[PDB]
GROMACS .gro file of C-alpha atoms in nm:
model
  146
    1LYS     CA    1 -15.453   6.428  -6.743
    2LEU     CA    2 -15.483   6.048  -6.696
    3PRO     CA    3 -15.197   5.826  -6.819
    4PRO     CA    4 -15.220   5.653  -7.159
    5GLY     CA    5 -15.528   5.435  -7.194
    6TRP     CA    6 -15.702   5.557  -6.878
    7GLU     CA    7 -16.058   5.688  -6.887
    8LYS     CA    8 -16.320   5.806  -6.641
    9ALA     CA    9 -16.663   5.646  -6.607
   10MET     CA   10 -16.970   5.627  -6.382
   11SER     CA   11 -17.113   5.327  -6.205
   12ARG     CA   12 -17.468   5.258  -6.320
   13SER     CA   13 -17.549   5.118  -5.973
   14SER     CA   14 -17.412   5.396  -5.751
   15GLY     CA   15 -17.326   5.692  -5.974
   16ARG     CA   16 -16.976   5.696  -5.825
   17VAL     CA   17 -16.697   5.792  -6.065
   18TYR     CA   18 -16.441   5.524  -6.145
   19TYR     CA   19 -16.142   5.485  -6.374
   20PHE     CA   20 -16.059   5.221  -6.633
   21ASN     CA   21 -15.810   5.153  -6.907
   22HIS     CA   22 -15.904   5.050  -7.261
   23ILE     CA   23 -15.566   4.892  -7.337
   24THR     CA   24 -15.543   4.678  -7.022
   25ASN     CA   25 -15.912   4.648  -6.922
   26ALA     CA   26 -15.815   4.745  -6.565
   27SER     CA   27 -16.072   4.928  -6.355
   28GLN     CA   28 -16.054   5.088  -6.011
   29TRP     CA   29 -16.217   5.354  -5.795
   30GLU     CA   30 -15.889   5.538  -5.749
   31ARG     CA   31 -15.758   5.792  -5.996
   32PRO     CA   32 -15.470   5.615  -6.174
   33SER     CA   33 -15.156   5.836  -6.113
   34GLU     CA   34 -14.206   5.439  -7.236
   35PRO     CA   35 -13.933   5.190  -7.143
   36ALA     CA   36 -13.746   4.968  -7.385
   37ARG     CA   37 -13.826   4.652  -7.188
   38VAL     CA   38 -14.088   4.543  -6.939
   39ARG     CA   39 -14.101   4.227  -6.727
   40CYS     CA   40 -14.445   4.075  -6.669
   41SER     CA   41 -14.605   3.774  -6.508
   42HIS     CA   42 -14.933   3.637  -6.639
   43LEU     CA   43 -15.207   3.384  -6.577
   44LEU     CA   44 -15.358   3.237  -6.894
   45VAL     CA   45 -15.693   3.064  -6.912
   46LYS     CA   46 -15.722   2.889  -7.249
   47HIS     CA   47 -16.043   2.805  -7.431
   48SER     CA   48 -16.156   2.583  -7.717
   49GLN     CA   49 -16.074   2.858  -7.970
   50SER     CA   50 -15.717   2.915  -7.846
   51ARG     CA   51 -15.457   2.864  -8.123
   52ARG     CA   52 -15.332   2.557  -7.935
   53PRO     CA   53 -15.619   2.431  -7.713
   54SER     CA   54 -15.387   2.228  -7.492
   55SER     CA   55 -15.177   2.298  -7.185
   56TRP     CA   56 -14.977   2.122  -6.917
   57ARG     CA   57 -15.290   2.102  -6.698
   58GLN     CA   58 -15.528   1.961  -6.959
   59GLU     CA   59 -15.453   1.759  -7.272
   60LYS     CA   60 -15.756   1.898  -7.459
   61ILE     CA   61 -15.899   2.236  -7.353
   62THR     CA   62 -16.278   2.216  -7.388
   63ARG     CA   63 -16.410   2.521  -7.204
   64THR     CA   64 -16.579   2.804  -7.394
   65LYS     CA   65 -16.438   3.155  -7.428
   66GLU     CA   66 -16.714   3.291  -7.203
   67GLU     CA   67 -16.627   3.016  -6.956
   68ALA     CA   68 -16.262   3.123  -6.966
   69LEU     CA   69 -16.363   3.486  -6.900
   70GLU     CA   70 -16.558   3.384  -6.589
   71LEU     CA   71 -16.258   3.199  -6.444
   72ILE     CA   72 -16.033   3.498  -6.519
   73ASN     CA   73 -16.294   3.730  -6.364
   74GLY     CA   74 -16.312   3.515  -6.051
   75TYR     CA   75 -15.933   3.496  -6.022
   76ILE     CA   76 -15.907   3.875  -6.040
   77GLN     CA   77 -16.170   3.894  -5.766
   78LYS     CA   78 -15.961   3.658  -5.552
   79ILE     CA   79 -15.648   3.868  -5.619
   80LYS     CA   80 -15.806   4.206  -5.546
   81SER     CA   81 -15.977   4.077  -5.231
   82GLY     CA   82 -15.653   3.928  -5.104
   83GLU     CA   83 -15.801   3.580  -5.077
   84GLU     CA   84 -15.528   3.448  -5.306
   85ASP     CA   85 -15.187   3.560  -5.428
   86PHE     CA   86 -15.148   3.612  -5.802
   87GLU     CA   87 -14.849   3.379  -5.795
   88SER     CA   88 -15.042   3.100  -5.624
   89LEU     CA   89 -15.322   3.113  -5.883
   90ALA     CA   90 -15.086   3.124  -6.181
   91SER     CA   91 -14.880   2.831  -6.048
   92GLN     CA   92 -15.198   2.623  -6.016
   93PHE     CA   93 -15.434   2.732  -6.295
   94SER     CA   94 -15.242   2.908  -6.574
   95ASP     CA   95 -15.272   2.704  -6.900
   96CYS     CA   96 -14.908   2.782  -6.985
   97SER     CA   97 -14.579   2.639  -6.863
   98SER     CA   98 -14.492   2.987  -6.737
   99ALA     CA   99 -14.687   2.855  -6.436
  100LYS     CA  100 -14.363   2.691  -6.326
  101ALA     CA  101 -14.218   3.042  -6.274
  102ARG     CA  102 -14.532   3.155  -6.086
  103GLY     CA  103 -14.644   3.321  -6.410
  104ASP     CA  104 -14.318   3.508  -6.483
  105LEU     CA  105 -14.254   3.560  -6.855
  106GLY     CA  106 -13.927   3.750  -6.829
  107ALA     CA  107 -13.845   4.085  -6.982
  108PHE     CA  108 -13.936   4.169  -7.340
  109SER     CA  109 -13.933   4.456  -7.585
  110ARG     CA  110 -14.199   4.543  -7.837
  111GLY     CA  111 -14.202   4.320  -8.144
  112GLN     CA  112 -14.206   3.983  -7.964
  113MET     CA  113 -14.543   3.922  -7.800
  114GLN     CA  114 -14.891   3.903  -7.947
  115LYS     CA  115 -14.981   4.266  -8.006
  116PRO     CA  116 -15.273   4.303  -7.758
  117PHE     CA  117 -15.057   4.138  -7.495
  118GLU     CA  118 -14.770   4.372  -7.582
  119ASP     CA  119 -14.992   4.681  -7.576
  120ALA     CA  120 -15.135   4.590  -7.235
  121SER     CA  121 -14.795   4.515  -7.083
  122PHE     CA  122 -14.644   4.847  -7.194
  123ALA     CA  123 -14.950   5.040  -7.074
  124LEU     CA  124 -14.911   4.896  -6.724
  125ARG     CA  125 -14.690   5.074  -6.474
  126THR     CA  126 -14.465   4.866  -6.252
  127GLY     CA  127 -14.679   4.693  -5.991
  128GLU     CA  128 -15.006   4.733  -6.182
  129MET     CA  129 -15.233   4.452  -6.296
  130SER     CA  130 -15.455   4.423  -6.609
  131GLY     CA  131 -15.809   4.317  -6.643
  132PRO     CA  132 -15.887   4.036  -6.889
  133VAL     CA  133 -15.663   4.067  -7.194
  134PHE     CA  134 -15.776   3.883  -7.508
  135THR     CA  135 -15.525   3.722  -7.744
  136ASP     CA  136 -15.515   3.432  -7.987
  137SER     CA  137 -15.389   3.213  -7.700
  138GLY     CA  138 -15.684   3.282  -7.467
  139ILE     CA  139 -15.753   3.530  -7.186
  140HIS     CA  140 -15.471   3.673  -6.976
  141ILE     CA  141 -15.428   3.847  -6.640
  142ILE     CA  142 -15.102   4.044  -6.673
  143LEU     CA  143 -14.891   4.166  -6.379
  144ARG     CA  144 -14.605   4.402  -6.464
  145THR     CA  145 -14.310   4.337  -6.234
  146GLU     CA  146 -14.034   4.551  -6.390
   0.00000   0.00000   0.00000
């Protein structure tokens, strides 16, 4: 039972059971339910410890890692509440020129991407979204589209 990476937990505030994934950092109340290639979109928030602390939006990225996590956490909130489309937030705020494609990164096999990014992408099912995903480039929201 439970697909790869998925676990069961309990809210400390309500005692209600929920489900979460260690590889993707996704979490949800609903019970969840390997290809050669996957296609994902992403939204990257960089921080001052990113490998290259620079992006098309900002010549020198100054924010802290914890500050980047709070932006990512707020963007996920906007996405899950339906206040904002994933594509609209990536186009505007992703610290990566994949923003021009609304976050699309194309299709890729294993062996190309940063490993935690790769592991998260291949643990997502088509249509699913990650929680914060930590890599040397910063913090990612990943959306698997194929």
